[PDB]
Each structure stands twice: as structure tokens, then as C-alpha cells.
Design a protein around this ligand. Sequence first.
Ligand SMILES: OC[C@H]1O[C@@H](O)[C@H](O)[C@@H](O)[C@H]1O
Ligand SMILES: OC[C@H]1O[C@@H](O)[C@H](O)[C@@H](O)[C@H]1O
Ligand SMILES: OC[C@H]1O[C@@H](O)[C@H](O)[C@@H](O)[C@H]1O
Lengths: 208, 520, 208, 104, 208
Amino acid sequence: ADGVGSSSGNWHCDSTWLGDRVITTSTRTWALPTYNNHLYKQISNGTSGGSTNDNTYFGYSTPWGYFDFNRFHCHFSPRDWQRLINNNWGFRPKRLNFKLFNIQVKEVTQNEGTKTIANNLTSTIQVFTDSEYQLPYVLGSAHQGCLPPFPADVFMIPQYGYLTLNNGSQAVGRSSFYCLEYFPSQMLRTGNNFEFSYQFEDVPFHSS
Amino acid sequence: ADGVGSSSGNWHCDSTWLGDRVITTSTRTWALPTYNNHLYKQISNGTSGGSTNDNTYFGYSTPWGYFDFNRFHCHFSPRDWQRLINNNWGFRPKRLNFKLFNIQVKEVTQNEGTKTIANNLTSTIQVFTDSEYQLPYVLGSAHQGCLPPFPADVFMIPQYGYLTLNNGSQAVGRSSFYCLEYFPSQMLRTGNNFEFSYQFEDVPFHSSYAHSQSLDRLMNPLIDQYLYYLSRTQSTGGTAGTQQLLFSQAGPNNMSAQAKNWLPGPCYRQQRVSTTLSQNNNSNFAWTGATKYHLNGRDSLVNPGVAMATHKDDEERFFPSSGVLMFGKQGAGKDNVDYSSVMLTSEEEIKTTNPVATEQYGVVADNLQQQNAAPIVGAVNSQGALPGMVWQNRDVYLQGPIWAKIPHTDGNFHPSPLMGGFGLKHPPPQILIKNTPVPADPPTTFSQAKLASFITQYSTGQVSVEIEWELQKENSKRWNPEIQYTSNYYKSTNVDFAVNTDGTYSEPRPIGTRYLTRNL
Amino acid sequence: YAHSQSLDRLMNPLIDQYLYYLSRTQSTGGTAGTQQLLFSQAGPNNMSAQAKNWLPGPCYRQQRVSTTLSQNNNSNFAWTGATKYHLNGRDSLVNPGVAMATHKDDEERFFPSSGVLMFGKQGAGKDNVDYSSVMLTSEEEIKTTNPVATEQYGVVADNLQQQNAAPIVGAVNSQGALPGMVWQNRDVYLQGPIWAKIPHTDGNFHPS
Amino acid sequence: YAHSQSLDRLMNPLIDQYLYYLSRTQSTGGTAGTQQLLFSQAGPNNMSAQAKNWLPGPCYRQQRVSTTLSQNNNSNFAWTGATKYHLNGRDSLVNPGVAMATHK
Amino acid sequence: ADGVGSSSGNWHCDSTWLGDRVITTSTRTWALPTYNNHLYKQISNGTSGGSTNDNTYFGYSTPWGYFDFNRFHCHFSPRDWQRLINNNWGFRPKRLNFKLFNIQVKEVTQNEGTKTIANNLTSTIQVFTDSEYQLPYVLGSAHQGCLPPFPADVFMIPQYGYLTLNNGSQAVGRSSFYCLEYFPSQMLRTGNNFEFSYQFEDVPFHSS
Ligand SMILES: OC[C@H]1O[C@@H](O)[C@H](O)[C@@H](O)[C@H]1O
Ligand SMILES: OC[C@H]1O[C@@H](O)[C@H](O)[C@@H](O)[C@H]1O
Ligand SMILES: OC[C@H]1O[C@@H](O)[C@H](O)[C@@H](O)[C@H]1O
């Protein structure tokens, strides 16, 4: 059974080369802060300032963070990449598997000038996936915040926000507002772990 | 198994639209403080002070808090409300399911000027429901403290208190005192969770639609009636006015004279107030000219009153003084706030079957005529129920109450709440919650006096309420397009029903439920 | 049973209502009384102004008679000032009448003229017997849900206001049934009748 | 069918009621009219004063018109003196109206 | 299973009126201090002081506390007492059931002038019952310290002591000393709970 004194899962990094499959895996350590003091916030940029008409936007910045593994260097060591590109004409993803485990939650307080950090055992986190693609899909825009290339680094989970139709800085009628707490999500304490599986749709081999 | 390191339940917010059912669910995060330092307290207000005889009360304020989900905006997003009111004639609740989970309990202490908060793992909370309705039922009075409309907000559980029979500020013999610790309750630590199910008693669908016909126009415009009415009592066109009885069939020419099977709903008049300021009288008539009912020597303003049309055709600006529900815009003060802050609801759609709130129900005769005496017809300001009378209930709103508890009494007439809602004889049980008190260190030598020193403490956690709604699908042969509830097309500074720059959610306008039409 | 709560006090004494009412129609504290509409949430301070779901039972007024003799008028109003109903050219005294509270708080001595059941003490004459012989029943307990028999049901407006005309509110002496209205039936007594036969008719309203 | 009994006459003509009513509020036969409360049981003598379980049906009044012409007033009151109900700013004559006896 | 994060039992207060039985139940919250700094102490009062010969005693005061429910108001609300005495000639107890649950144990320390209190998860308490009546029976002397009449109060468990044969303040040869740690007892941490059942011996109805 789960508990505060037993680990949720194990560290895994490998590249398993078998036949025509290569299974690459990566594990990282992350730190997820509290964004916007738990607030949704309208964000916008108008032409009123030094901005031009091209740079205007309207959107919302949420408290939620998100994982981005979308860069290759996350899943391949430079040697694993070398085996790939030297020996092979093409490669395409088949399926992925994703895990959250070993969750520590820590409350930090300020007393005079000294900082102190202590475990909070009863606090939770909320993790959902959008399976039905009912959110603005923010990946694929080549934003920062991916898992580090090098497994020993700890990384910070980026904040989630999205952009919507605008006219200038003002919002039009078709502008959408998405409340992310309105999805079903799974709440995890320090003994809980999160996992799901995904299977890529058939896609033509990248031609290397 | 449960423990400090495993979550009790999961976050859920959805609207599941399947067939004639819609299952709406909501989860929030709450914080429950310690009220009255764990004391029951008599509270009362007498006429001795500046108070009048109408405002006096006697009652008790408990430590217990309670959950109130009774407003619609708790269970529906503004989009889920739009699917509802556009596509459907009626809806009624079927069953609900309610959950407490992920309970954190935290003790806070003061050292010099610095505050610190730390988990207390062994502390509990007490949660019971009154299933048998053995408590004053405090819901349905449209009090604050409901779950926020917007799921990201954390809310504070309101304190529970109740009022009892009084004479002045003093209590009479039939005054009841209820000790809430005297019920069985369930005590929960941080790994425990609480749940119960409830099933609504069969209740008539709230009718969301407008009539496409006024009540008096149900006639055929083409054909005359075979019935006769008394058109003229005096000889016409003659040099002498000697009376003669002359009769006529009513027809398309005079419809107001036709015989009709049905009468408008009952009328209890309101005072008329115009939004344009120069039209209203100069005085304060708000309380004095108000429509009141007198109960046990106390004049109680009638609010909102019986369901009655707000205004007649082509008068937008007039509204009944107490007649309409009034909602405040986000961040509106509690005292003497200007007109621009409140959102006045209006009933346009019941003009067909219901009388205008600010005008007389009709006219009746005050005397028996004679050749000597002229006929005199008096106005009817108040009209109770008469046979062959039809009316519409007040419209529910996205901000308004869902249900109310039909008082337990010998008799009632059309038991539906005047605020609008579903009158229920056994409403959802009200859920009471409290922090179990933890004593501060007692003395080392015994003393009978009860312990007045407690650890300052509060608890937080997650609450889920899931209601299954039954829908009445719209089936109509109407050719031309319906009116729908549509958001504004033109550009805006910020989106409606969404957070502003600073993070504050706001609801721009009240959304009534009836855009659809039916034949009367 | 009696209700432990009055009908208008069903509210929570602690919490304000999210509904607003019209508190003041005139500019307050200003040297000029120019009208302005001002709204307020009702709360523990003013309970009489809160929005309420339910209304008192129907009212058909009675004449008020005081047991203390010097308070009553000097005349015989028993038949003349009585509350009667006129059926087929015959005026029939309304006795006991609809169920209505006998008297309000801290008035013991007043009773409705025809409103209450009246039982005689053992060996009481049939004609013009003194007050001391009869036993007046009284309804204290329906004061919560029912109006007092000797007072008006309420007050309604008699006119449509204008800048020229002041608002005028008329009294409601008789009130039939309205939606959202609750009442208690008259109390049975040890000396009183057990049942009655509901006449056979097309329609009846709350046949008790 | 018609009822063979009026609503107020459902009583027994033979027997008195054990209930009392307020017959007289003033001292009778005395040189001074000082008020005194006096009670009586209703009986065959005064039936109009008896206690009754039931009340007549609801009433919404109509104007009275006589077929004999000289009795009616001289004017046209047909529309003006009519019993109307006001719905959405339109005055609609109440016809035939609630069920009520035509004449006594 | 028991643990620090799961409650031991539930709150119960009721009066169940069924036939000729009435089952009354009560739950309270208590606080048990540390008496005598964990010491047994001889206590005595002699005539040497202002005391007279009538007021002299010899006995021992223990660290142990004890529960006293022996007063009626513990088991009956004033309404439950009213149903009892109005409708019934006699009543006698049949059986009782007794429970300890939801035990918090807290260590308090002094630092300068500031007090602080914190959970001690590993500390225990010792609870036994004397079934064989091998102790001085201290109940029935109408001492204070019963459960409060009103369920919302928290009460303090009284200290346990007893008196023994004396001559003056001095002890005679038949004086007994009872060490309460010399009984078998059950030791409870914060997840443990204590319960036992008892069945009254047949006793004549109290005649009300
Ligand atoms: O002066 C105006 C006030 O009059 C009081 O009787 C009443 O409690 C208030 O609601 C307000 O009407
Ligand atoms: O003079 C007083 C009397 O008046 C009569 O009309 C009536 O029958 C009596 O009950 C009494 O009221
Ligand atoms: O002049 C008399 C006429 O008055 C009108 O208002 C009405 O339409 C007619 O039915 C008739 O009453």
C-alpha cells in the first residue's frame, strides 16, 4: 500500500534497442510553484503602448502548469541519437507511457528575514490530461520549459496560458474562456502516483 | 486504506448531457473556521434600541457551519445554462450526491507578532445531515455563503443560527433550543471522507418558455361568437335617450367584449417606481408606500411577492418597488448602493397569463344601479384565487435559489416559492459541519468549571455536489426562429462571464430561463 | 402542535441575503431632496425587509371585542358591526370563520367577535348569559402561520405614483388564497365536533 | 342536479347548538347603556347566528341590469359600468364570469 | 486498520424510545491532565491544626483520573427527562456500553514566556476498569466531575484518591495502600480505542 514512508516508483532511464523498436525512457525531478496566487488573469497587449498592430494579443494566464517533453533531446542521449541517425533511414513514434511519482509537497513561510521549508503531508496536487483536446493545445509552439537534456538537472514546470481571438487588446464575442478546474482531475497526496498510456496514430516515417 | 499520505477523492467538474438527463457536478475548496469560540449564544434584538417592532428577533447562533449549494450558478457554467434554457422547455432535479474529502485540519498560534500554521494530524471534524428535518431549515432564505459560481474560488462556510418565537426581544414559552451536538454525527480525520445520497421527491417541471399567445387572445380572429353580450343600454341615434337593451355578438371588431373561459392569475399590487429619476415622486416612499403584510403585529415587506408581470408593453423603465428580484453586480456594497450596481430582473414573459404588478387587477361594481343612481365601478387592487384562473410561476435565474422547503402545515395553496424554485416538502438535507474542539492545557488541580481555553484551529478541504437533472425536450412546429440567449457580438473590454485583469470573476447580467415559446 | 418558528422568521439570523431591496428612494444627507434610487441587502439589522418564500394564510376580518368592558364602545354592535356573508338575500353571521389567530402578542383581552368557538360552563342558560358563564377558546398557536383575526391582512397600493402624486397604500381587510400561502386549520377541542360532512359539490377549496 | 338545501340551512331545525355567540354587547332594559358582554346559544329562533362549517363560493361582482326598462338607469353603462379585468394594459370584459347565481 | 489519519469512532447522542426500552447515549470531549507529577501521595488531615476530630482523614491521592457519569443529567436531555417522568411509573437500567475513541495526546513546553502545544503521536494512555471491585469505589459519593449536562461542553477528568482507616492523622495497621499500576490495563495510542460492556443486576424499578 501507499504511504508517506514508501516510494511511489523507481528511477528509469534507458534506451532499449531491440529489432526495429527502440524504447527510450527518461526520468527527471521537477518543481512546480504557485502561479498567479491561484488566480486566472486576463492578459492582453494593445497598440496603445509602443506595441504595433502585429504584436497585440488577448488571452488568459492560469495557475496551472504543464509538462512539455516535446523536444528530442529529452528522450535521447547524444549517443542514442547517434545510433539512430547513423544506422536508420526512418523512425516514427508508436506509443508513450507517462508517470508522476514520489511527490513531495512543501510549505514555505517567512519569519523576519529567515526562510524555512517543511513537509506538508496532507496537501495534494491536481493532475489531469486533456484526452479529448478540449483545451487550447499549447505544445508545438517551441516554447521553453522542456525536460532538461541532461538527466541530472531539476527543472521548473512552465505556467499554462492561452491566446484567443482579439480586436486590438479588446476581446471579441467569440473569445473563449476556459476554466481548467472544470475538468475532472486526479488529486494526489505524497503516496499517490499518476500514470496514463497513449498510442500514436499511424504517421509516415520521418525520412532520415 | 485511508491515511495521511493518500488522497480521499478526486476533483470533479462536468456537465454530462445524455438524452433527457443532464448530470452536473461541481467541486470546490472550502475553509471552515471556529465560530463563537465553540459556544452556543443567545442572540436577540429588541425595540429598546433604535430598532422598531418589525425588526425584533430572538434566536441562537451556534458554532456549527453549513453548506449551501442552493443557487443555480453553483451547478451550471454560463454555457451549461445556455444549453439548458435554449434547447429545453422544462427541467427538474432527480437526485444529488454529496462528498467531503481531502480534509486538512490546521492549528494556528500567535507568538509575539508572527503567525504560524501547522498541520494537526489527529484533529477531527463533525459532519452530520438532518435527514428527518428535525432542525430549523435555514436554506431557501437566499442567504449568502453559497459555493462560488466560479470553480477556482475558495469559499468560507457560513455560520449556522436560527430564529425562534419571540415577544419583543424576550423569549416565550414555546421557544425551542436545539443543541446540534445532540445529533449523531460522523467524525472525520484527514484520511476519512464523507458522502451521502439524496433523491428528490416528484415535483412539477419548472416551465422554461414564454407563451406565444396572450390569455385573452386565444380566440379565432376570423369567426364571430354565437354568444351575445350587452352592447348598448341606451337608445342610439334617437332624439330622446330613453333606455333600451340592445345585444350584439362579439367578433373580430370588438375582441375585448368576447366571452372567455379563463382569467388572469391572482394580483396583489405593488408600488410603481421609475428608473428615470425625474418621474418618481420626491419623498422617501420606499418603506412607507411599500406593499406590506401584517403578521402578528409586525409589518413585513412583501418581497418579491406573487409572480406578476414587471411592466406592460412599451414601458421599460417602470418596475414594481418590491416586486422584482434584485442582484448586485460584482463588488457591490451592502448599504444604500446606487442603482447602477444592482441588476434588476424583469418578467416580460408572464404578461400573457399574469397581471402587471403595478396596475389594478380589474374593475368591479360598487353599487346596485337605479333609474335614480348612476353605476359606480370600483378598482380591484388585490385579488385572491377564483375558479378558472391561470398563472405562471416566477422565473428561476442563474443566480437565484434552486429550491425552498414547503413549510409543514395543515394547508397551502399552490406551494411554490415566491422567489422561484422547486417547492419541496423534503428538500435536500442541510449539512452541518464543525471543528471538534481541542482543549488547551488544563490546570493540574481539578476544577469543575468548563474549559474555556482552546487551541485556535480551522479546517479546509474539498466538497463535491453532483445533481442529476431531468429535461423536458422542446418539440414544436413553430416555423420562424426562436429567441435565444446569445452573448454580445461586438467587441468588449473584457469577456463576459470571465475573469478580469485582476482575477475577479463577474456575472454581467441575470439570465432568465425562458426564451422558448409555447402556445398558451 | 404549535410551530416553534414564526413564518417570517424562517431566515438565518447570522447571514445577509444576496438579494437586494429598495431601501431609499430619496437622496440622503443632502441639502436637496432630489430623488435617487438606492438599494441594500437585507440582513439581521432589518429582517422585515428580507425576501421571503411564503405568505400568511388567508384573512377574512372580524370585529375586535375586549373582555375589559370600559374599552369596548357603548352601543350594540354585536349584530350590526358583525362580519356577515350574504347568501341569497339572507345575511348570515360568519361563525367561527376561517382559522385566524385570536389576538397578537401581549393582548389577552381582545377576541374576534364571531371568530372563536364559545363553550358554556355547566348549567349555562341559553339566552343572554353573562360573560362569566361562557368559556372562550383562543388560538395562540396559529399566530405564526396565520393572521390575527381582528387586524388587516396587509397593505397594498391604491395608485400609480407620479412626480405630481404621492403614493397611497390601501388596507387589505379580506384576502383570498394566493400562491405560496400557508395556514393552519382550527384546533379541535375536547368539547368540539370530531368531523363534518364535506358537501357534495363540483368544487371546494381545502375542504376542512 | 340542484341542491335541495341551501348552504346555510344545513342545520337541524329542532335542536339548539351547544356553541355560543355574542348576542348583545350592551346592557339591555337598563336606564344606562353601560356595555356588558352577553352570550347566547343559537337555535331555531335565530338561525342566521348559528356556527357553520362552510362558506359560499367565491364572488367577483357583476353589474345589475333589469329587463324592465324603466328601472334601469338612463345612460349607456354597458361598457363603462362593466366588470372588466385588466391584462397587459388591455381591459377585457369578464364574460360570462365566475359561476354565480343570476338573481335572488 | 487504525492509524493517525483515521478516526477511531463516531459522535453519538440520541434517545431511542422503543416500546418499554429507552436507550440513551451521550458523547463528550474530555481532557485528562497529569496529576501529582505522576506520584502517589499520602494525604492526611489531623486535629493538630484548626481541624476537629470529626474532619480528620488519612488516604492516598493517585495520578490516575476516572470517569463519572453517575448523574442523570448526563444521560438525559431535559426533554428526554420530561417524556420519562410524565408517561411512566418506573424505570431501571438494564445494560450500558462505554467507549473511548479519537485520542489526541499533546506535549506542552515552556520557552521563555511563550507556550506551545504539539502532537505527540507515540505517547499512550492507560485505561483499565475494575470489574472485580478490588478498589475503593469512589463513585456514589456525589462528587463533582461528571460529564457536563450539555453536550457541547468539554470537561476535565477528576483525580482519583481514596480514604482508609485512620486514628487521628496517623494510619493504623489495617490501612490499605493500593497501587493502581498493579492492575492489568490497556495502553492506547492515537489510533487505538477502548470499549467494554456492562449489564446491571436485577434491581427494583424506581417508583416514579
Ligand atoms: O425610514 C425608512 C425605514 O422604515 C423602517 O420602518 C424600516 O425598518 C426600514 O426598512 C425603512 O423602511
Ligand atoms: O337587534 C340585534 C339582532 O339583529 C337581528 O338582525 C339578528 O337576527 C339578531 O341575531 C341580532 O343581531
Ligand atoms: O362606447 C362603448 C364601447 O366602448 C368600447 O371601449 C368597447 O370596445 C365596446 O365594447 C363598447 O363598450
